[PDB]
């Protein structure tokens, strides 16, 4: 994995040693070249994973999350060029440094073969993420957002640290490959109940689980555009990736310990979807959409079937491109009107004809229109949960209705109707804005043709 | 607030329309419209102001009980089948300041002519502001409608959007 | 209780501006000032060939429009599909599955020469 780690580190010298007026050009160009080379990780075999060394490996679960990660960095640099326009050069090159350092921790996190190496980099992503939110947020609530985003994660991460070390002293190794052959069943005792929670609550908070989600509406809303894109596109999937790995060593206790977290997800799925029907902030509405969508991933991971895992992986990748796209679309409006209220600028389809097409395509994937990978992932989870309990179709069907209501309501409150009269600064769509959306949707739509590469290790 | 005169006049306007919807046929509308017209004439000479109100509160109630459950609506009114059907075509006029020169040159007469109106507004605005502030109570304005042009040359204050509103049938 | 003197004056003043503004919304004969558009020689032939009415020849012209359409939209796509079906789809098992034909008594099988005996005598009647 050094072939991707070293180039990522060399972007930092590139930014600092580049011309004062070429920081964006050089970083964007060379970050796209790193993304292009990540396609070599798809050399996957049907029996064994691609094991590079004692430290790093990449299987069919890590590969799609790596390509989305390295592909997201170029798109975050395009989105940041506007609000970082009157910023002094040194701080602009520090902002890019934080983004690069975040990618470096992420790709190593998704390939760490050792679960304690996974933990360190897993926690290492908080530092740059916190710095981006609090130093380059526009509102006074960004300072409070960082505290919520920091202490919610650490409140659950520290118990995970103890549990991981306890496992090593018992099994003898936290290397993932070894655990696949040395895993022993978990007895039903009170000690193992809290070992289960410690190993899982660190990831429930990041997914996030309903009830433990109050940090997301504060962090995703106060963060700059680049922070929101990575926050909702990759950093939420850090929790999902964690469960898919650590649930290996929690059987058969996951059969009953998952009930409280399936009801929070199945019901919290409906609640957060309902919240989006009455949100007065466009960015906040998208934040609550991630909570509703990630509720499916928790259910799929906790029922442990070949179809649930296939759906969860496609859902995590599908939501990553969609959620990032929606934040970018919402920011283009903000860059003009400079206000997050959803009912302030209406009828935008009359002033920005092309940007309205992106809104439609973004909304359709959000509501899982087939054959998009948004539907493929959601459909597979629905098939698996039906076999888990036939009554769940009621809850996951009601969520479909609500998801279509708030997604098209978002598309109708901003793009249709009557244009606001007193807003006269809605300039045409820049090439930067249009190209930013095309990069989100084209790969999202292209994956439909060959979707087996995002179906995970159980394909 | 409406005047007692207007309320009777309104209830007469509604009654014929709702009456028309029931009748459909024009010949039967005249035979019944006159009778309704006749009934207003009975108390048209009323000058009590306490029994005229009493009948009016029974006139509206009589209308409500027998109102049509689906009155005819002209197909461009608040409830018709083509209300706001062309609001998607009513682009503002300030959007042309953002046009590209490669496409602004497509209409050399139009945009040369536009600068006249912007000058006619940019120079006129200060006069329009002055006129409004000097014809208003010290506390502040008390109603709608604005003073018209007093002298020559000056245009009515707050005229740009009223004059330049998008054409009701853009395309 | 119609218009107060001010209101009529304002409406006429606005109506003088409004109807001048709408008069501005007309295009001179030159407008739009289109760029120099190239005309293909194939277009030149038909423009000069049609010109006058000549209803007799317009039958052929539609055939030319249809001859091209039947070529690029029917003949080319069917060539691709037949080539695709005959050499990539049909070369794999059960990609195309045909419901076996309905055989009847008193017929000969084109492939093996087998003959199916006709049905028994019919105890039928009239009407």
């Amino acid at each position: 994995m050094l072939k991707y780690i070293i180039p990522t580190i060399m972007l930092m010298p590139l930014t600092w040693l580049s011309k004062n007026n070429m920081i964006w050009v050089n970083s964007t160009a060379h970050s796209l070249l790193i993304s292009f080379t990540s396609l070599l990780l798809m050399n996957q075999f049907g029996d064994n994973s691609l094991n590079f060394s004692l430290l790093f490996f990449s299987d069919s679960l890590s590969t799609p999350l790596l390509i989305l990660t390295m592909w997201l960095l170029p798109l975050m640099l395009m989105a940041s060029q506007h609000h970082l326009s009157k910023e002094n050069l040194t701080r602009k090159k520090l902002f890019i440094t934080m983004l690069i350092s975040l990618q470096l921790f992420l790709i190593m996190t998704f390939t760490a073969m050792e679960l304690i190496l996974f933990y360190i980099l897993f926690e290492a992503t908080l530092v740059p993420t916190l710095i981006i939110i609090t130093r380059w947020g526009n509102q006074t609530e960004r300072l409070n957002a960082g505290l919520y985003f920091l202490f919610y994660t650490l409140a659950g991460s520290l118990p995970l640290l103890v549990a991981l070390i306890y496992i090593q002293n018992t099994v003898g190794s936290l290397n993932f490959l070894m655990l696949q052959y040395w895993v022993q069943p978990v007895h039903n005792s009170w000690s193992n109940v809290f070992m289960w929670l410690a190993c899982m609550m660190a990831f429930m908070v990041k997914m996030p689980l309903y009830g433990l989600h109050l940090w997301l509406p504060k962090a995703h809303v106060e963060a700059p555009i680049a922070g929101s894109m990575v926050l909702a596109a990759v950093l939420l999937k850090l929790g999902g990736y964690g469960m898919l790995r650590i649930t290996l060593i929690l059987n058969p206790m996951t059969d009953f310990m998952a009930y409280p977290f399936i009801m929070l997800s199945l019901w919290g799925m409906i609640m957060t979807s309902s919240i989006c029907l009455r949100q007065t902030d466009l960015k906040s509405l998208i934040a609550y959409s991630s909570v509703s969508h990630m509720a499916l991933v928790i259910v799929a991971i906790l029922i442990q079937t070949p179809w649930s895992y296939m759906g969860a992986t496609a859902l995590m990748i599908a939501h990553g491109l969609t959620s990032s796209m929606l934040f970018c679309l919402a920011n283009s409006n903000y860059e003009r009107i400079h206000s997050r209220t959803m009912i302030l600028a209406r009828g935008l389809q009359t002033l920005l004809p092309l940007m309205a097409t992106w809104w439609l395509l973004a909304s359709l994937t959000n509501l899982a229109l087939p054959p998009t990978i948004n539907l493929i992932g959601e459909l597979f989870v629905v098939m698996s949960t039906f076999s888990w309990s036939n009554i769940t179709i009621i809850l996951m069907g009601v969520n479909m209705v609500i998801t279509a209501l708030y997604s098209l309501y978002m598309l109708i409150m901003t793009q249709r109707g009557k244009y606001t009269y007193h807003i006269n600064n809605i300039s045409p769509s820049f090439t930067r804005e249009n190209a930013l959306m095309s990069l989100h949707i084209l790969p999202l739509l292209l994956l439909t043709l060959n979707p087996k590469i995002i179906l995970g290790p159980l394909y | 607030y409406l005047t007692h005169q207007q309320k009777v006049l309104r209830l007469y306007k509604r009654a014929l329309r709702h009456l028309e919807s029931w009748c459909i046929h024009r010949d039967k509308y005249r035979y019944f419209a006159c009778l309704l017209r006749a009934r207003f004439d009975e108390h048209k000479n009323e000058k009590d102001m306490v029994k005229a109100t009493q009948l009016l509160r029974e006139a509206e109630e009589e209308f409500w009980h027998g109102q049509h459950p689906q009155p005819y609506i002209f197909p461009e009114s608040p409830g018709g089948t083509s209300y706001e059907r062309y609001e998607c075509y009513k682009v503002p006029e300030w959007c042309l300041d953002d046009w590209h020169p490669s496409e602004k040159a497509m209409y050399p007469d139009y945009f040369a002519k536009r600068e006249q109106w912007k000058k006619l507004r940019r120079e006129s605005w200060e006069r329009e502001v002055k006129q409004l502030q000097e014809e208003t109570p010290v506390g502040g304005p008390r109603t709608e409608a604005l003073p018209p042009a007093r002298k020559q040359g000056d245009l009515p204050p707050l005229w740009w959007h009223i004059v330049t509103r998008p054409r009701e049938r853009p395309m | 209780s119609g218009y107060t003197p001010e209101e009529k004056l304002r409406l006429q003043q606005l109506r003088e501006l409004r109807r001048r503004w709408l008069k501005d919304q007309e295009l001179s004969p030159r407008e739009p000032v289109l760029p120099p558009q190239r005309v293909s020689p194939v277009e030149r032939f038909w423009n000069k060939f049609l010109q006058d009415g000549a209803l007799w020849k317009n039958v052929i012209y539609k055939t030319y429009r249809h001859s091209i359409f039947a070529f690029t939209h029917v003949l080319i796509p069917v060539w691709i599909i037949h080539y695709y079906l005959k050499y990539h789809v049909t070369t794999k098992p059960y990609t195309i599955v045909e419901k076996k034909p309905r055989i009847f008594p008193g017929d000969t099988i084109l492939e093996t020469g087998e003959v199916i005996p006709p049905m028994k005598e019919f105890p039928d009647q009239h009407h």
Partner: peptide
């Protein structure tokens, strides 16, 4: 009798 249709900039 050709009128001018006001549209948002379609060039970009």
């Amino acid at each position: 009798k050709r009128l001018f249709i006001i549209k948002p900039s379609g060039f970009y």
